[PDB]
Amino acid sequence: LILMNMEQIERASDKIAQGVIIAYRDMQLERDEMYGYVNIARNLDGFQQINLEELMRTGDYAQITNMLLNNQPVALVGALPFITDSSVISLVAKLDATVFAQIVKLRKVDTLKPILYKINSDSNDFYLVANYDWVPTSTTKVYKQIPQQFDFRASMHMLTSNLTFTVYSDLLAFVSADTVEPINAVAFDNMRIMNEL
Amino acid sequence: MDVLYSLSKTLKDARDKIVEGTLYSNVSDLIQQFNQMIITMNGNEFQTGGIGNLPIRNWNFDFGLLGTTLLNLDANYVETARNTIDYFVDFVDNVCMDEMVRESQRNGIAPQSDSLRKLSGIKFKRINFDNSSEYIENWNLQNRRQRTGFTFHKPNIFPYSASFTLNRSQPAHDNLMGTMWLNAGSEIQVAGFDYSCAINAPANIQQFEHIVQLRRVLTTATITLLPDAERFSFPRVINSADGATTWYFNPVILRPNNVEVEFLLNGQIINTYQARFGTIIARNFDTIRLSFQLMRPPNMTPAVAALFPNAQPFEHHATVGLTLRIESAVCESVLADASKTMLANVTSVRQEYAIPVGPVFPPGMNWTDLITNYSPSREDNLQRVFTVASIRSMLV
Amino acid sequence: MDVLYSLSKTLKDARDKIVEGTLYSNVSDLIQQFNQMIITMNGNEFQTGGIGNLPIRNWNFDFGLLGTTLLNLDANYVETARNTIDYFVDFVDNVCMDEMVRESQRNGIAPQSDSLRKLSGIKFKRINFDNSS
Amino acid sequence: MDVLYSLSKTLKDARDKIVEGTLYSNVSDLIQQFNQMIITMNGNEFQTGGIGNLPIRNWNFDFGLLGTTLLNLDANYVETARNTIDYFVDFVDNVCMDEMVRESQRNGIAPQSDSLRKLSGIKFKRINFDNSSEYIENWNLQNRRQRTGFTFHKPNIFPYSASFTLNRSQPAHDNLMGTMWLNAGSEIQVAGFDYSCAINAPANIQQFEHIVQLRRVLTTATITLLPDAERFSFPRVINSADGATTWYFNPVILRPNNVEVEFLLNGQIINTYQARFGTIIARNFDTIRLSFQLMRPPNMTPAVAALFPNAQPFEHHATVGLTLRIESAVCESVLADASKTMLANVTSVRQEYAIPVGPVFPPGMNWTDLITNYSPSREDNLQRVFTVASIRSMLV
Amino acid sequence: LRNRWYWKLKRDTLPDGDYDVREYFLNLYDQVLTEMPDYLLLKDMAVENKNSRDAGKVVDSETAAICDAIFQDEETEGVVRRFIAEMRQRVQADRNVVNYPSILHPIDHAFNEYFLQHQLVEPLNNDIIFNYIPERIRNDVNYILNMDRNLPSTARYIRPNLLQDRLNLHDNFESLWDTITTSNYILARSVVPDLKE
Ligand SMILES: [Cl-]
Ligand SMILES: [Cl-]
Ligand SMILES: [Zn+2]
Ligand SMILES: [Zn+2]
Ligand SMILES: [Zn+2]
């Protein structure tokens, strides 16, 4: 049960994403009911995948460093903490593209914190989106899943059990156990254990 | 009857409405009625009898009530309900078969099988709910002595009869005047034949009268009337009234004259149709009187004039016809008809279990014998078995 | 071929074993294999070909897993399983038909249809299990 | 049926798997299924009935569960399992025999014996598990109105028939033209014979046509077609159709000309084979139309020209044969075939216990009579008894 | 202007890094195993449904809170509201069975359904207690065994797992086997009777 539901449980967490795609092309921000505009990736189709756990374990940063230096599109896969940035100015500053160079500097991946933009009317600078003609884009996307909606029909169950019972542990406490007088105790052969009397 | 019908109707509603994925609110009232049925039937033993080859069957009812737990019904719920429904349908079908094969001379309207007599007990009256079918509604209205009627498409109201009356006859059967007729089901095909073509009639007119007394009163009847009788318009070799010899019939069809259809009730002229053909309406009648005249054509072409000489021998016998078809009517008593299966159902059950001939019905439930001698006791027994058969048809 | 056979064998076992009233222990390994098949197939598009009069068909997999926590399978369980089984059976039959009507001279033993070539990818090797026929 | 099959399958698995020394992990699921069967059956009384000479038997189930606390099965465990297994195998054999000898016109698909009807109750559905046999698979599919399929090696689809048709004949029976055939099992041998060798036929061609209508649709059928019919290629003295006199046949075999085998479904040509003999495939058909021509050979050596004069007497009769053998096919209905034993088992059980003839099957379960008149009710009863026979043959 | 209902982790404590996520789920497995119930009696968790028009009860109080929140929500379908108001538990005391409505996430439902369907309590009667006594003591005439207690049909017990050694510590574990025989020897010393006269 745990193994089959692991992926669903992990993807429900609000503090880890499942990866980050660095695509040095300008990709439109998705329109998601949970965010407004969000640089969210539904899947990793179309990108080479670097497993972050394997990279941490090997210590060999040659391929990742070469790809980052040469701006080769890639998808870093692994449980990652992410920053939720609600500032349109941050997106225009393209700050989501500024977070990977520390990987090469330190040869670590445990401080990689990609930027997940969350642009909507609650952003202080949302008017820039509203009052100008332009498509909000970013060069990175965060591989994360969307929460499952509550559905009453799929959530209502009938649970059945017994009305009541009593569990017992000491079974031998239900047994009345006497012995014969030891003078009359017999062995397997039905004669008295001690017969010299 | 009302309890048996209510059981059948509850089961039919359960089978049609307790379906996978249906809203709980589609079935709330049905679930209540079904649980009331289960509670009433629980702890009751029934025996469906061993008349004929119908096997003796024992029925025990210990069933759990249906729950009310899902917004949309699921397969588990339908499965439990279907198990209960199947057992109940088996029981109801057996009770219906058991009742359909019994009869009584005195109280033929009352239940006859042990199970239906038990279901008439006060304890089972709680099962009763909507009695909406034509037959159960007629049954309830008849128990209260209220006027009600069964609607029949092509009622089998005429006992089968294919015979003739000769008004002028000779040993050689060559100058014959009379009538042939087939009365079958909802059809009356009558014909009047004159071998001389009314050569010597007072005004060259021969009058033919056919009177058919209906065994029950019919109301609101739509009837088709057609001038000719196709069944008596071709040459025939017909047995004599005793069958000693056979005579010859060589019809030539002439237009019926002074056609008069009278529909009579209690001897009063309820409806009269003179020379009217096609669709006619007979309000309410128990007798049909068809009076038609063969009129020798005053002017004839030479071929026609040659068909009918002035004296014997006669070779081309002048025939006038009439065809009456009751297409649909209303009768206060149950009757066989072309659309319903009640008679066929009762007869099939009686034949398939070798039910011995009883003291009410003719052997084999023959409809001609039944309708010919349609006594009040036969009417009561037939209404009972037809209501039971219609209750059975809702499930089987 | 081994993967296509594994899909078919899984579906045949599910038809034969996922039946009302049966103990879950009778089917537990089969349910694990079936859920593995669903997981491996989910999110993949397939096209069975238009060769001859065989119509072009598109196949999508977004199925949920079958339950594992009942003592005995019930009617709801069987209906839920049957819904997924029917689609998988249709897909496997179409892949088999698409592969049966194709031939190659250079490499006739290798798969010919696009679906069977896609199913030979390593990403589908998880489906593979008992090859007993 | 699925519960009876599940009992039999559990018993077969226990016989095969519960062996001395085996790892308990080899049997854990089987042990759980077996204990579930014991719990479900415990406390239930069954009567396998006394139809015919089959003895009445009473079955009582009070059995202990099989242990679950071993690492390897030992002799004690195997003996404890085997006593219970023996009793259960006896019970299943008697239930299967009770069901095989029974039939009904109404619900021949439904159970007939009391024990199987009892086992259809919901309180036994827990026993149900892997339904992997072809017969039980098709049983479940047909319960759901799904496309069924039975694979048959040499299906017994043709009722035995050794007949002839004479399209040219006379009292002397010496200038005859016609066809003779044996349709038996999966084989059709047909042979068209012309005594005049088509001397006077238009174009010196005599066309012969043989249409065989299969009582069920066959699909995916592999068929061997052979030019000659060895059954009608030797001299015979054949009775006349009325049986009054015997005529003489002295064939000399010519190769058939323009052989056309059509496989037709509802009268539409599904497959057509012209002048092809080796091995053909009829994908879906219920009719086989064999057209074949005797062509008088235009050029002859003197001996051949001697065989076939210009006029009578004709002593060497030109016969063109054809053999059609269905080696393997698929049918949506159960059928006897050369490899299975369902028909033989059902017939053997009915014979051994002197089961009186019933309303559905012909006496002795004669296959020719059965398949000639393969009615839907016959199909239901046959599928039921054949599935029960396969269940029995799993254990006996 | 409206919020939407979504399923969220009650405790969102997932770490970063795939290996640490798998460690988290191993710890979750251990938590479930340690807190796995041996039996359940739903009536103990049965609380009142505030909107019930038929004296309805639900399990558990979390279901009550969720159902009330759904009942009050303006965006709820009228059919769902009526069903919340009508949904009924079924207590069959004659059969010793209870059924309650519950609102659960499918994963939570799977866990609770497994717990309900795989309880470790078996029916306890006098025959089981009598057979629990070692057979050679039931057959020794020096001991008189009686069953002076009536067990109700609601009595339950949990069977001990007396499987024989799957590790074979008597084979090639000299130190462990020495300790096992020493401890057994100490116990046997405690139970041997003292000599008299
Ligand atoms: Cl009509
Ligand atoms: Cl062979
Ligand atoms: Zn009509
Ligand atoms: Zn006369
Ligand atoms: Zn002849």
Curated annotation (Swiss-Prot), chains B, D:
Superkingdom per UniProt: Viruses
A GO CC term assigned to this protein in UniProt: T=13 icosahedral viral capsid
Primary location: virion
InterPro entries, sorted: Capsid_hemagglutn, Rotavirus_A/C_VP6, Virus_capsid_a-hlx_vir
Entry's Gene Ontology BP terms: fusion of virus membrane with host plasma membrane
Binding site for Zn(2+): 153
Compartments it resides in: Virion
Pfam families xrefs: Rota_Capsid_VP6
PTM section of the record: The N-terminus is blocked.
Annotated residues for binding of Ca(2+): 266, 286
TM ranges: none
GO molecular function: host cell surface receptor binding; metal ion binding; structural molecule activity
Biological role stated in the UniProt entry: Intermediate capsid protein that self assembles to form an icosahedral capsid with a T=13 symmetry, which consists of 230 trimers of VP6, with channels at each of its five-fold vertices. This capsid constitutes the middle concentric layer of the viral mature particle. The innermost VP2 capsid and the intermediate VP6 capsid remain intact following cell entry to protect the dsRNA from degradation and to prevent unfavorable antiviral responses in the host cell during all the replication cycle of the virus.
Additional free-text comment from the UniProt record: The VP6 trimer contains a zinc ion located at the center of the molecule. The zinc ion is not essential for either trimerization or transcription activity of the DLP. Zinc-depleted VP6 has an increased sensitivity to proteases.
Family: Belongs to the rotavirus VP6 family.
Stated name of the protein: Intermediate capsid protein VP6
Organism of origin: Rotavirus A (strain RVA/Monkey/United States/RRV/1975/G3P5B[3]) (RV-A)
